Amino acid sequence: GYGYYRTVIFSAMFGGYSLYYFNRKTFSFVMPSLVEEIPLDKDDLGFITSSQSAAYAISKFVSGVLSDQMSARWLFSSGLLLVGLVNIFFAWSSTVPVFAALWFLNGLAQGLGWPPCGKVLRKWFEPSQFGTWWAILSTSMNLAGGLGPILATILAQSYSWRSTLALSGALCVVVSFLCLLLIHNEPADVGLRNLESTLQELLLSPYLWVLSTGYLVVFGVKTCCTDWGQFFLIQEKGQSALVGSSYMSALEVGGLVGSIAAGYLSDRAMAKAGLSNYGNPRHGLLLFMMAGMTVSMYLFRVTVTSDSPKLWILVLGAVFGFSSYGPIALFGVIANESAPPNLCGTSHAIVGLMANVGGFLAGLPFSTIAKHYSWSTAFWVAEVICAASTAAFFLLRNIRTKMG
């Protein structure tokens, strides 16, 4: 009788996470029609966004460490209420400091979304199907971000800005009780069945640092290419400004399909596996996609000129997105799967912590080296770094897998 329970649990988690991500960018969704009532500038916008980003960055790690002990049913609902209440309070106030102080709590509550879902997925679904549903659930954020602007446009036309956030908060509070009532933390509670590791042992496993370095390199390269690619294409390749938007759209469209396909293929690879404590069945795609990333970077840098047509650029962007948005999901799955059953949350939190520094590296230093020599001089550096990391991961493949 696993079918009904799995269906209802996944539906509840999908709706809950869609609402969590929708109630995170609602400020940006309603921003246009908010300056006429309260006169602001770009500095206030930066202040609020920075406060939210810092709060989210801290809360992700804190929640990831905490969720290993507290229930994964009383977090996924408490965070959603808090988000809804903060949204309502934002709706019923109009001044910069209350906005800045409320959005900090918004981010702090937003940080409590994923770890409970990951824990429930690990302790409910099969070990050979844990990557497909992970990838499918990850697309709720994409769906919310792609459909939200349209709903905001058709809603704020017939109402005001304070008339939208109140409804969003009411919806969040209403659905919080449903997600609390429907989610079962473990299959043993109902009456079904499913199938000694200190934290120091987790911190004393080389595989964790290998995964951390891989995630750092992949995320840094992706951030660099998705940030300064338009500037490279508009100031060195002599292309029209129109091709940048198409290039980014192709990159995102390819990335979504890449994530889903990587999840499904890695899950399929596990069925035909001679389970052991050495190696990893998901390592084939964790290397093939990185090689594809390097090849696509080389082709984008070398064989692109004003003579090149639009189709070539679109294909290159799609291939780069397909090869770039997959290894991130695979790193997440591997870090949340190769850990002791009572320490899944901590390992994922430590791996994800290694991404803020990657973003910082992909930020100002890249602009500095571009300012000193050129854009191509920095893209070549990124290329060689990625190639060296791919090689190093290639030789270091049979390292011990099970942490602890």
Ligand X SMILES: CCCCCCCCCCC(CCCCCCCCCC)(CO[C@H]1O[C@@H](CO)[C@H](O[C@@H]2O[C@@H](CO)[C@H](O)[C@@H](O)[C@@H]2O)[C@@H](O)[C@@H]1O)CO[C@H]1O[C@@H](CO)[C@H](O[C@@H]2O[C@@H](CO)[C@H](O)[C@@H](O)[C@@H]2O)[C@@H](O)[C@H]1O
Residue numbers at the binding site for ligand X (CB under 6 A): 46, 50, 53-54, 57-58, 61, 136, 139, 142-143, 145-146, 149-150, 252-253, 255-256, 353, 356, 359
Min dist CB 255 to ligand X, Å, is 6
Nearer to ligand X, 145 or 404 (CB): 145
Nearer to ligand X, 165 or 256 (CB): 256
Nearer to ligand X, 85 or 386 (CB): 386
Nearer to ligand X, 160 or 230 (CB): 230
The 8-class DSSP code of residue 400 comes to B
Residue of this chain nearest to ligand X (CB atom): 145
SS (H, E, C) 242-289: HHHHHHHHHHHHHHHHHHHHHHHHHHHHHHCCCCCCECCCCHHHHHHH
- Given a contact cutoff of 8 angstroms between Cβ atoms, the answer to whether 202 and 347 are in contact is yes
- Give the position of tokens 């770039």: 324
- Give the position of tokens 């006169």: 39
- Give the position of tokens 């409804």: 167
Triad 396, 401, 404: Cα angle to 5°: 130
Nearer to ligand X, 230 or 356 (CB): 356
Whole-angstrom CA distances from 401 to 249, 271, 283 are 37, 18, 11
Instruction: Give the gyration radius of the chain's Cα atoms.
Output: 22
Min dist CB 49 to ligand X, Å, is 6
Whole-angstrom CA distances from 145 to 21, 28, 139, 183, 337 are 8, 11, 10, 25, 28
Q: Is 39 exposed, middle or buried (0-12, 13-18, 19+ CB in 10 A)?
A: exposed
Min dist CB 109 to ligand X, Å, is 16
Nearer to ligand X, 114 or 280 (CB): 114
Nearer to ligand X, 18 or 389 (CB): 18
Exposure letters 82-93 (e unless 16+ CB within 10 A, then b): bbbbbbbbbbee
- Given a contact cutoff of 8 angstroms between Cβ atoms, the answer to whether 330 and 282 are in contact is yes
127 vs 340: CA distance, rounded Å: 14
Nearer to ligand X, 54 or 170 (CB): 54
